[PDB]
Design a protein around this ligand. Structure first.
Ligand SMILES: CCCCCCCCCCCCO[C@@H]1O[C@H](CO)[C@@H](O[C@H]2O[C@H](CO)[C@@H](O)[C@H](O)[C@H]2O)[C@H](O)[C@H]1O
Ligand SMILES: CCCCCCCCO[C@@H]1[C@@H](O)[C@H](O)[C@@H](CO)O[C@H]1O
Length: 536
């Protein structure tokens, strides 16, 4: 092989800080543009700072002879991360690790493209091999030890000096742009990794149950009450026909006119599925939401099931993120019906094949959840059939960043056309059931980025997330028997829907109010969207 001293680590640091991390320096030049006023030293020196800082932590990490394993891993992962940071504009924070950790083979394989593989292999696996090849000439364990600790420390001070010489620039820039740090590799996922490790240990707590005395309190002589909750995926409000978008992407629901209540101002709990799902079914408002406490207490379905309601969850995304484990549920995607399914994913209309079994399961009030794959990208083109391919040209690849933005928007507007007909078909299975007080409720889990300022997919840090990812659609439909006997004032409801802001925080108590449930301590009347319009 080749023989280096270290040295080997200055090269490693030259690479990591100067080759990868393009996304990081790209973001700061965007946030802090050149102009010539000599304040650009803040930009020029900045790679130098990161070099020194990388030299520092790599002297501490590159220990013999675990480093021959640990460094290639870091180089290979930095490549895998920097690629999507550079082209998709993602951040690698703790939540992004929860994505990676909660994913599936079908779901993540769609992310692979030849350029991605080529990137990883040329910027990750290769430098890894080059590194592993090098035989390192250690000095005497005392002479070697001293040489490491002095370099590691002068590096830090060199970085601290260069920054301290420019303290107000650093202080300003990073107090305003606190998340830009989740762009730096590898502090990135290491930081997220220990932060998740800390969460792992702090997770030994017991299981709290909530609302143990809940019961239904439906009047005597009441029709069965059947509620369907359609959980969307990735569909955003800005491309939703009912919300006034240039294209009627919801023509079937627009056609139903007034019987469909549309909410033009609703925001999500999170901007990823792993975050939004568990949160919206938990008691925690977005700003109180704790991942760990939520995982270890009863959620909405647990409580609603305790009250005697029949809860079924049919799944067609990558899983229910832990929300459905204690209620009857089905992985509909695994039926692999060639009419709907290819490559381990399915068109949402497959869910409708199992709908009637649930509807005729028994004769007590029910909550049925249809968890859909919706507008899930990057393979948006799989989210609809030819019948809904109304806007063209389309982006028929997972390489969504090489499509033109208009071509991508087209493809994504076709996914909504499929969302729209899915909801419509659910309503059709119910609207003629005169013996049934039925409600169909739809909301998405989060929106999506469609290439704006260079950002694709979703999962952005909420605090800096764009409207596209947080502003989501929501509609409600009520069957004829519900409108006769459900006690709701429908014109009141239309007005509230038009005038008020809502969010996922209204989900929990809205669903509980639809089941007429007594003795509930978790129910909050002021978070039930219909309470204000319920009579008497
Ligand atoms: C293990 C140490 C960290 C290195 C792990 C390797 C990561 C390499 C870069 C991957 C980061 C980008 O890849 C990321 O993958 C996950 C799941 O596939 C996607 O996330 C997808 O699944 C998760 C979980 O079901 C959902 O919360 C999310 O809504 C959905 O987008 C991200 O949208 C995508 O951006
Ligand atoms: C090699 C350059 C190091 C720069 C370090 C920047 C500050 C540390 O940034 C960490 C992140 O790395 C970490 O992912 C999250 C986890 O919650 O918390 C931040 O404080």
């Amino acid at each position: 092989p080749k023989l280096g001293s270290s040295a080997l680590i200055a090269f490693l640091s030259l690479y990591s800080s100067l080759v990868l991390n393009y996304a990081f320096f790209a973001k700061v030049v965007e946030l802090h543009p050149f102009n010539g006023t000599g304040a650009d030293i803040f930009l020029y020196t900045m790679p130098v700072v990161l070099f020194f800082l990388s030299n520092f932590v790599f002297h501490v990490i590159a220990l013999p002879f675990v480093h021959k394993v640990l460094i290639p891993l870091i180089l290979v992962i930095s490549a895998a991360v920097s690629y999507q940071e550079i082209f998709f504009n993602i951040y690698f924070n703790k939540s992004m690790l929860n994505n990676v950790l909660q994913t599936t083979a079908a779901e993540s394989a769609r992310l692979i493209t030849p350029g991605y593989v080529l990137w990883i292999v040329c910027l990750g696996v290769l430098p890894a091999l080059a590194y592993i090849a090098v035989k390192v000439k250690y000095r005497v364990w005392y002479k070697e030890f001293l040489t490491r600790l002095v370099l590691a420390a002068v590096s830090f001070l060199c970085a601290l000096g260069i920054a301290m010489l420019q303290y107000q620039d650093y202080a300003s820039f990073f107090r305003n742009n606190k998340s830009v740090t989740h762009l730096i590799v590898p502090s990135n996922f290491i930081g997220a990794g220990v932060s998740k490790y800390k969460d792992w240990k702090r997770s030994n707590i017991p299981y709290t149950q909530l609302d143990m005395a809940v019961v239904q309190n439906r009047p005597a002589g009441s029709l069965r009450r059947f509620v369907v909750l359609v959980v969307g995926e990735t569909t955003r409000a800005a491309n939703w026909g009912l919300n006034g978008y240039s294209r009627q992407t919801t023509p079937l629901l627009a056609a139903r006119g007034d019987e469909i209540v549309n909410f033009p101002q609703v925001r999500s709990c999170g901007t990823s599925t792993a975050h939004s799902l568990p949160c919206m079914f938990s008691t925690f408002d977005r700003t109180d939401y704790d991942e760990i406490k939520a995982e270890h207490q009863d959620n909405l379905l647990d409580i609603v099931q305790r009250a005697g309601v029949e809860v079924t969850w049919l799944e067609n995304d990558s899983g229910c993120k832990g929300v459905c484990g204690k209620v009857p549920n089905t992985d509909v995607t695994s039926l692999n019906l060639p009419e709907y399914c290819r490559n381990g994913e399915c068109l949402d209309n497959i869910l409708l094949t199992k709908f009637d079994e649930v509807l005729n399961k028994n004769d007590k009030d029910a909550v049925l959840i249809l968890h859909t794959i919706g507008s899930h990208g990057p393979t948006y083109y799989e989210r609809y059939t030819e019948a809904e391919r109304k806007f063209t040209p389309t982006c028929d690849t997972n390489e969504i960043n090489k499509c033109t933005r208009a071509t991508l928007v087209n493809t994504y507007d076709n996914t909504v056309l499929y969302v729209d007909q899915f909801i419509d078909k659910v309503i059709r299975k119910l609207e003629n059931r005169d013996d049934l007080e039925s409600v169909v409720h739809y909301v998405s889990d989060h929106g999506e980025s469609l290439g704006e300022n260079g950002m694709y997919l979703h999962a952005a840090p909420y605090a800096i997330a764009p409207s596209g990812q947080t502003h989501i659609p929501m509609v409600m439909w009520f069957s004829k028997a519900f409108r006769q006997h459900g006690g709701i004032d429908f014109q009141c409801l239309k007005q509230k829907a038009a005038e008020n802001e809502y969010s996922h925080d209204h989900y929990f108590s809205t669903v509980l109010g639809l089941m007429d449930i007594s003795n509930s301590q978790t129910y909050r009347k002021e978070m039930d969207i219909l309470a204000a319009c319920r009579r008497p």
